[PDB]
Every structure is written in C-alpha cells, then in structure tokens.
Amino acid sequence: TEKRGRIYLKAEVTDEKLHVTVRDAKNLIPMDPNGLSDPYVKLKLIPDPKNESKQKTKTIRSTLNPQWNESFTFKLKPSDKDRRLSVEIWDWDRTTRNDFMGSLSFGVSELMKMPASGWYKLLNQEEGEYYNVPIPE
C-alpha cells in the first residue's frame, strides 16, 4: 500500500561508473513485534537475470530512522542503457524470512542526463521497480 517513509540518496554517473550514496531514511514502517525494524538496503541494476549486480548496506538494528552513510559503485556496460538502478529497503529477520519495507528506482539513461540527490518517497515493491518520487518540498 503506502506511507512507507522516505530515503535520502545521491546517484550520479561519471565516466561509465554509477556512484550511489545511501544516506539515511526516516519514518519507515514497523515490521517487528517490538514495533521497529532492522533495515538494510539492496541495490541492483535490473533486469539482473544472473543475479550478479547486488550490493547492500549493513543492517542497522532496531530503528525506523536508519543512518547508513554508505557508498557504492557499479561499472556500467552498453546494455545498461535499458536498465534501472533498483533501491529496496528490507527488514533483516533473525527468525523469519526477511521482508520488504519500501523502494524506488532510477533509469540509468535518466541518471546520465541528470544526477539524483535528495529525499525520495518510498514506494511499494512493484511500483518501486518502475519510477521514483522526489520530495524536495
């Protein structure tokens, strides 16, 4: 559904490399019995059939307002013109399968035209693979 918090990201392409900085997120949805979550962020260039592009932040336990401050780099290839950078927050779970918290994505070609910087609204899993919603206001 919706109202999943927001995330602050920077994503820019420079000389065939995509640099992404995952800063922090605010107001995430509770996922655990204790009312909090143990969030981490998965980054991928999709489609990724062979599942080779995945990178992830560390897991921060017991918070709905994580501050990761982590950076990542992807080397781009020509075929990436048809790919998107997918950013998904998931809850790490000690005793159950990990579950989805919120997401968004950027087209590689679009980032090449204009870098991304700022706060973004977290979307549901399907929606997140298709667009993003900046919230500069």
From the annotation, which residues make up the binding site for Ca(2+)?
A: 31-32, 38, 91-93, 97, 99
Round to whole Å and give the CA distance between 104 and 129: 6
Binding mask 84-123 for Pb ion (x = CB under 5 A): -------x-x-----x------------------------
User: Whole-number minimum distance, CB 9 to Pb ion, in Å?
Assistant: 22
55 CB-near residues (< 8 Å, 6+ apart): 42, 43, 44, 72, 74
Choosing from 6, 38, 60, 122, the residue that interacts with Pb ion (CB under 5 A) is 38
Q: Report the candidate in 6, 79, 2 with the shortest Cα–Cα distance to residue 46.
A: 79
Q: Residues binding Pb ion: what is the number (CB under 5 A)?
A: 6
